[PDB]
Amino acid sequence: HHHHHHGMASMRILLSNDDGVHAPGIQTLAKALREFADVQVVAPDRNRSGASNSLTLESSLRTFTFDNGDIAVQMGTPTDCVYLGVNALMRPRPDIVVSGINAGPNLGDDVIYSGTVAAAMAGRHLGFPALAVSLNGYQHYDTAAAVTCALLRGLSREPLRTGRILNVNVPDLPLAQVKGIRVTRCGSRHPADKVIPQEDPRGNTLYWIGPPGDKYDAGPDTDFAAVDEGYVSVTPLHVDLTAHSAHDVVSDWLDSVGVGTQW
Amino acid sequence: HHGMASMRILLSNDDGVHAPGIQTLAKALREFADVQVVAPDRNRSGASNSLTLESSLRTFTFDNGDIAVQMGTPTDCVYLGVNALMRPRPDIVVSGINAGPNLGDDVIYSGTVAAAMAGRHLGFPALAVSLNGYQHYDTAAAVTCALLRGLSREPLRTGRILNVNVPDLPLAQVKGIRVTRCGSRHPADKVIPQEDPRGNTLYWIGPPGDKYDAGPDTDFAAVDEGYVSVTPLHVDLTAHSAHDVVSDWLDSVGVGTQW
Ligand SMILES: Nc1ncnc2c1ncn2[C@@H]1O[C@H](CO)[C@@H](O)[C@H]1O
Ligand SMILES: Nc1ncnc2[nH]cnc12
Ligand SMILES: [Mg+2]
Ligand SMILES: [Mg+2]
Secondary structure (H helix, E strand, O other), X not given: OOOOOOOOOOOEEEEEOOOOOOOHHHHHHHHHHOOOOEEEEEEEOOOOOOOOOOOOOOOXXXXXXXXXXXXXXXXXXXXXXXXXXXXXXXXXXXXXXXXXXXXXOOOHHHHHHOHHHHHHHOOOOOOOOEEEEEEOOOOOHHHHHHHHHHHHHHHHHOXXXXXXXXXXXXXXXXXHHOOOEEEOEOOEEOOOOXXXXXXXXXXXXXXXXXXXXXXXXXXXXXXXXXXXXXXXXXXXXXXXOEOHHHHHHHHHHHHHHOOOOOO | OOOOOOOEEEEEOOOOOOOXXXXXXXXXXXOOOEEEEEEEOOOOOOOOXXXXXXXXXXXXXXXXXXXXXXXXXXXXXXXXXXXXXXXXOOOEEEEEEEEOOOOHHHHHHOHHHHHHHOOOOOOOOEEEEEEOOOOOHHHHHHHHHHHHHHHHHOOOOOOOEEEEEEOOOOHHHOOOEEEOEOOEEOOOOOEEEEEOOOOOEEEEEOOOOOEEEOOOOEHHHHHHOOOEEEEXXXXXXXXXXXXXXXXXXXHHHOOOOOO
16 A cells, blocks of 8 residues: 555564663654554563673562553563563564663673663574664664664565674664664774772762773774764674684693693 | 792682682682682672673672672672772683583573673683582682693683583593583573462573584583583674675665665
């Protein structure tokens, strides 16, 4: 009939985040996805920014269902949410996990700390590649929602053959000002070094973790560079932490220092 | 003592400050190095690279000088150790000895690995050390000490984190070391539901998926064959091999192009 999307409920999406179920990023995105997808939100009960791929192992998890059908996992991490949503809670099972929209970027080596990214990585085995979506700010959730809907419509047109996780960072701009899209690699930062002390009412010093370090590798092929230049950044991710290129150096080093070998 | 300089180690873990793995290791390391423990106050296995951002962190210092971070994650402990609690900054982070392995694609969830990753910008590559069981902490301590002597004999030029898994055997039975890559598992899919006394269903995370990639060059295979597995890790999660396929895909579906 000619509509922007084919089907009002053609894809089953598990939508999660790490800002928590009440966050404007996930709620704005849910409203956009519900136009064309069958969406089930399964997200943390509060802001779990910084949760990375942490899992709850020593306790069981309780869920809470809101009047609108959204599910919070109480005390749940983003990884808990996706793991339970895929493997226990959702029927039918999701075709895809979408995680976001996060309030703030997930770029460079920040990605391994990101609970937004971790929710997506917990969906890497599904029929479509998982999407992690982060806004470089707090102002244009509508832009990030539009980019996400475009990517999802793209997946309906042709399957993506390689890459199981897409880390998407959206500039905080009206859509008409976004320049385009770049496929990027993760940049990197200097080590974060700030600790912010704050005395409690009894005079004891407590410590706040400081902000990320300055950009270090923010070259033209990086996610940083794309966002900074007004492009959407798309970086395909994987979970293999092996530094493959260090293999021979490490082997030769062990031999040279006689650890593992008698001579 | 012997060299021109003492090695100054920040030692952490995620089993908790009182765990036998970290205390066994601390005793061994203090024979030759200056050791500062900064570790979670409790078992935080599965903490991955999580960071406490929502609250400030409280520390406790024990009579022996060990520092526990109350509700701190392993990454929190290393962050506070490197940036506030040790002056000057440590030479190296050593994390472990973990009670149990950290192998294959499970490494991304490991708080033992995360503490080592948090030390990746120091003067020596960080060590994460995990015992494939609970008996031979002594074996894993001896292996760690050997690596640390190794790092002071010649610099390791490439690789900022070494993930070390030690078979749970007496030292005499360990065959040697293999430099490995992380193996992988099938998708984990088991949830263990248990009702509370009111009939509400609560959910436990189940066992990992069965091994998928666990052949000859993997960390799994090394440990199974009685070798220490050493895998260099990095924090760049980019799937570089997918770049062209993703770019061509976007073009083919008209996302980011008018044509
Ligand atoms: N000290 C820090 N180290 C790393 N990431 C930080 C820090 N402070 C804030 N963040 C950001 O918060 C996000 C939560 O994971 C991280 O992705 C990271 O970019
Ligand atoms: N069930 C599980 N799934 C994924 N990672 C794990 N690490 C420990 N248990 C796990
Ligand atoms: Mg967040
Ligand atoms: Mg542990």
